[PDB]
Amino acid sequence: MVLLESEQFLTELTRLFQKCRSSGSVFITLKKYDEGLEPAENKCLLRATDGKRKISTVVSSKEVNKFQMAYSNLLRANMDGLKKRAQGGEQKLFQTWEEFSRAAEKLYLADPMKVRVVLKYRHVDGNLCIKVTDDLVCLVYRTDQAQDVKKIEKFHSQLMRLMVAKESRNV
């Protein structure tokens, strides 16, 4: 795997999406990650693969806004081979997107350090899949509607912001 820079990751990601158009899938995983005395630096690890070549990057609160503007655009642009214009969540151990989102959100807030957010895009099949799990409870949401790409991206991206957000702890 290869730890990359913000922009080196985004270019490498784009290449993954490009190589899996005739076949394959692109998986993306997100997760919280852990002289003069500075309060530290909250982060999230971002990994992606096409089954052969594995890449990763570490985003912090100092660059989520700038990163996310590029990252959000790249997801929407590259995940474009969907039903022009199947759908539905699962509570494993929701039909509506609404029920899925809420459930996945509580699962995240429960224990931020143990939860993994997964994205799987299969261009050839014309389907996108998002999974939020803590390895015990699993919540997935499958779609083939090009209209669901936007909200699935915005959501996945908001979780990223929660992972990175800094909290004024009070010593």
Side-chain angles (χ1 to χ4, degrees):
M1 186 175 297
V2 162
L3 217 53
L4 299 180
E5 197 71 352
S6 277
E7 275 223 1
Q8 177 81 357
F9 174 80
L10 295 174
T11 63
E12 190 69 359
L13 185 56
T14 305
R15 293 183 192 180
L16 283 189
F17 271 125
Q18 267 152 38
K19 180 180 180 179
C20 306
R21 241 148 149 60
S22 52
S23 76
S25 1
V26 176
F27 296 91
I28 301 181
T29 63
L30 179 59
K31 199 158 185 206
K32 255 268 245 290
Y33 158 102
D34 189 346
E35 300 180 0
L37 341 121
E38 285 315 347
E41 304 175 359
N42 235 323
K43 305 180 183 190
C44 79
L45 182 64
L46 208 50
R47 298 190 270 176
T49 310
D50 64 315
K52 303 172 183 302
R53 152 187 91 167
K54 299 189 180 180
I55 65 175
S56 58
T57 192
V58 176
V59 190
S60 65
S61 38
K62 300 289 180 180
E63 63 182 10
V64 261
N65 301 326
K66 300 184 181 184
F67 180 79
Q68 294 216 320
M69 275 203 268
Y71 185 63
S72 169
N73 290 158
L74 191 168
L75 291 183
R76 294 183 184 167
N78 291 256
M79 299 200 305
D80 67 357
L82 247 58
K83 303 245 160 160
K84 341 102 196 207
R85 191 70 180 180
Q87 244 179 344
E90 245 158 306
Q91 176 126 340
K92 176 163 183 179
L93 188 70
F94 299 91
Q95 71 190 0
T96 66
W97 162 246
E98 196 175 356
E99 296 181 2
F100 167 87
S101 288
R102 304 306 167 75
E105 186 189 297
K106 180 180 181 179
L107 174 47
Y108 173 71
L109 270 1
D111 199 1
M113 293 298 311
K114 304 273 181 38
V115 184
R116 183 192 314 118
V117 180
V118 180
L119 280 186
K120 174 194 185 174
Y121 182 64
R122 208 144 205 288
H123 197 66
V124 70
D125 295 340
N127 59 48
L128 175 57
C129 181
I130 191 176
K131 176 167 72 176
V132 169
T133 179
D134 67 355
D135 292 314
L136 201 234
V137 296
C138 192
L139 314 180
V140 309
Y141 188 88
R142 302 187 191 282
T143 300
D144 59 359
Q145 297 301 356
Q147 69 184 0
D148 294 332
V149 174
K150 177 179 184 174
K151 59 192 192 180
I152 292 192
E153 103 72 38
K154 298 192 310 170
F155 182 62
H156 156 103
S157 291
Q158 181 171 228
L159 300 180
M160 183 179 298
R161 293 203 293 286
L162 297 181
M163 301 185 174
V164 126
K166 190 65 181 182
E167 201 180 0
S168 311
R169 186 44 187 200
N170 89 311
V171 98

